[PDB]
Enzyme design. Sequence first.
Site, PDB file in Angstrom:
ATOM      1  N   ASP A 121       0.788  -1.195   0.000  1.00 48.71           N
ATOM      2  CA  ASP A 121       0.000   0.000   0.000  1.00 48.71           C
ATOM      3  C   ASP A 121       0.828   1.255   0.000  1.00 48.71           C
ATOM      4  OD1 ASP A 121      -3.041   0.343   1.999  1.00 48.71           O
ATOM      5  OD2 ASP A 121      -2.168   1.855   0.704  1.00 48.71           O
ATOM      6  N   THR A 122       0.902   2.017  -1.077  1.00 47.99           N
ATOM      7  CA  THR A 122       1.691   3.225  -1.076  1.00 47.99           C
ATOM      8  C   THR A 122       0.945   4.348  -0.394  1.00 47.99           C
ATOM      9  OG1 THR A 122       0.790   3.589  -3.265  1.00 47.99           O
ATOM     10  CG2 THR A 122       2.977   2.527  -3.096  1.00 47.99           C
ATOM     11  N   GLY A 123      -0.358   4.185  -0.161  1.00 47.78           N
ATOM     12  CA  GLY A 123      -1.093   5.258   0.511  1.00 47.78           C
ATOM     13  C   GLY A 123      -0.983   5.234   2.026  1.00 47.78           C
TER      14      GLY A 123
HETATM   15  C1  LIG Z   1      -2.084   3.595   7.883  1.00 52.74           C
HETATM   16  C2  LIG Z   1      -3.515   3.462   7.335  1.00 52.74           C
HETATM   17  C3  LIG Z   1      -3.626   2.099   6.641  1.00 52.74           C
HETATM   18  C4  LIG Z   1      -4.526   3.586   8.516  1.00 52.74           C
HETATM   19  N1  LIG Z   1      -3.744   4.557   6.355  1.00 52.74           N
HETATM   20  C5  LIG Z   1      -4.920   4.752   5.733  1.00 52.74           C
HETATM   21  O1  LIG Z   1      -5.949   4.051   5.878  1.00 52.74           O
HETATM   22  C6  LIG Z   1      -4.934   5.885   4.721  1.00 52.74           C
HETATM   23  C7  LIG Z   1      -5.792   7.046   5.251  1.00 52.74           C
HETATM   24  N2  LIG Z   1      -5.713   8.154   4.294  1.00 52.74           N
HETATM   25  C8  LIG Z   1      -6.395   9.373   4.836  1.00 52.74           C
HETATM   26  C9  LIG Z   1      -7.927   9.222   4.880  1.00 52.74           C
HETATM   27  C10 LIG Z   1      -8.728   9.660   6.020  1.00 52.74           C
HETATM   28  C11 LIG Z   1     -10.047   9.541   5.443  1.00 52.74           C
HETATM   29  C12 LIG Z   1     -11.290   9.874   6.030  1.00 52.74           C
HETATM   30  C13 LIG Z   1     -12.478   9.570   5.298  1.00 52.74           C
HETATM   31  C14 LIG Z   1     -12.405   8.937   4.004  1.00 52.74           C
HETATM   32  C15 LIG Z   1     -11.123   8.661   3.401  1.00 52.74           C
HETATM   33  C16 LIG Z   1      -9.985   9.009   4.161  1.00 52.74           C
HETATM   34  O2  LIG Z   1      -8.702   8.845   3.775  1.00 52.74           O
HETATM   35  C17 LIG Z   1      -6.279   7.752   3.005  1.00 52.74           C
HETATM   36  C18 LIG Z   1      -5.467   6.561   2.433  1.00 52.74           C
HETATM   37  N3  LIG Z   1      -5.462   5.440   3.413  1.00 52.74           N
HETATM   38  C19 LIG Z   1      -4.637   4.344   2.878  1.00 52.74           C
HETATM   39  C20 LIG Z   1      -5.516   3.375   2.134  1.00 52.74           C
HETATM   40  O3  LIG Z   1      -4.827   2.976   0.986  1.00 52.74           O
HETATM   41  C21 LIG Z   1      -5.833   2.132   2.910  1.00 52.74           C
HETATM   42  C22 LIG Z   1      -6.692   1.021   2.291  1.00 52.74           C
HETATM   43  C23 LIG Z   1      -6.708  -0.193   3.224  1.00 52.74           C
HETATM   44  C24 LIG Z   1      -7.733  -1.258   2.801  1.00 52.74           C
HETATM   45  C25 LIG Z   1      -7.587  -1.963   1.570  1.00 52.74           C
HETATM   46  C26 LIG Z   1      -8.524  -2.934   1.231  1.00 52.74           C
HETATM   47  C27 LIG Z   1      -9.603  -3.191   2.097  1.00 52.74           C
HETATM   48  C28 LIG Z   1      -9.771  -2.495   3.298  1.00 52.74           C
HETATM   49  C29 LIG Z   1      -8.834  -1.528   3.660  1.00 52.74           C
HETATM   50  C30 LIG Z   1      -8.109   1.539   2.017  1.00 52.74           C
HETATM   51  O4  LIG Z   1      -8.753   2.056   2.932  1.00 52.74           O
HETATM   52  N4  LIG Z   1      -8.559   1.323   0.770  1.00 52.74           N
HETATM   53  C31 LIG Z   1     -10.010   1.403   0.512  1.00 52.74           C
HETATM   54  C32 LIG Z   1     -10.405   2.476  -0.395  1.00 52.74           C
HETATM   55  C33 LIG Z   1      -9.839   3.729  -0.486  1.00 52.74           C
HETATM   56  C34 LIG Z   1     -10.290   4.555  -1.517  1.00 52.74           C
HETATM   57  C35 LIG Z   1     -11.323   4.132  -2.394  1.00 52.74           C
HETATM   58  C36 LIG Z   1     -11.889   2.872  -2.242  1.00 52.74           C
HETATM   59  C37 LIG Z   1     -11.419   2.083  -1.194  1.00 52.74           C
HETATM   60  C38 LIG Z   1     -11.760   0.629  -0.971  1.00 52.74           C
HETATM   61  C39 LIG Z   1     -10.471   0.101  -0.259  1.00 52.74           C
HETATM   62  O5  LIG Z   1      -9.514  -0.147  -1.279  1.00 52.74           O
END
Ligand SMILES: CC(C)(C)NC(=O)[C@@H]1CN(Cc2cc3ccccc3o2)CCN1C[C@@H](O)C[C@@H](Cc1ccccc1)C(=O)N[C@H]1c2ccccc2C[C@H]1O
Lengths: 99, 99
Positions: free
Chosen positions: A25-27
């Site tokens: 995960d690069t995010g």
């Molecule tokens: C250290 C950690 C992991 C807590 N960081 C994050 O969750 C950050 C938060 N920021 C800061 C952040 C805070 C915040 C508050 C409200 C809303 C968004 C926010 O983003 C936004 C980016 N994310 C990273 C994401 O890439 C994490 C990823 C994890 C995941 C993957 C698969 C299933 C479940 C969880 C994630 O959340 N991806 C989801 C995802 C993301 C975008 C679009 C669709 C989806 C579906 C799924 O891929």
Amino acid sequence: PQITLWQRPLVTIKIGGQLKEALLDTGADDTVLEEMSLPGRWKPKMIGGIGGFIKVRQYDQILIEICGHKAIGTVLVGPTPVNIIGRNLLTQIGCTLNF
Amino acid sequence: PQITLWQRPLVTIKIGGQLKEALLDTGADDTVLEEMSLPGRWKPKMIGGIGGFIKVRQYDQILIEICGHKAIGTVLVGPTPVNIIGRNLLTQIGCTLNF
Ligand SMILES: CC(C)(C)NC(=O)[C@@H]1CN(Cc2cc3ccccc3o2)CCN1C[C@@H](O)C[C@@H](Cc1ccccc1)C(=O)N[C@H]1c2ccccc2C[C@H]1O
């Protein structure tokens, strides 16, 4: 290896003898693992994502071998639906994003 | 480019004549931008992550440039702090993870 992004970028990690699957995960700034036992003392931390914040236990200087490459770093352990290998360990195995 | 991961991978995207900053995210299935207004009709979409699920407005066939590379696709709009470019538009600009 060169990983395309059509499917989720999952890889096998070896962590504390257990081989688990995980997402490159690069995010993600931090690395977050699903509920497991790691030796050592921990801090609590709160980390927030898409829903909101969850509480995790912060273990420092833990060894993960991510896809044949060893890495040492901070690992947070708690209620995640998937194991996230974030930027703190991705730099260590020399991971880049290319286009 | 060849982007390394010591800092967060932000890029300038341009959408609706304005330049914005977005995070490149291989663990995000979809692209989610901050609350803005976009053309046409939307549909409902529930996305989950750490801390559970949230509801976003789905817009389709929207043009967006990432590093001067144009992509036309689906962008979700909702209550996020950082704009996220997910796998659905990173495969369009031909982005890979390398290590
Ligand atoms: C250290 C950690 C992991 C807590 N960081 C994050 O969750 C950050 C938060 N920021 C800061 C952040 C805070 C915040 C508050 C409200 C809303 C968004 C926010 O983003 C936004 C980016 N994310 C990273 C994401 O890439 C994490 C990823 C994890 C995941 C993957 C698969 C299933 C479940 C969880 C994630 O959340 N991806 C989801 C995802 C993301 C975008 C679009 C669709 C989806 C579906 C799924 O891929």
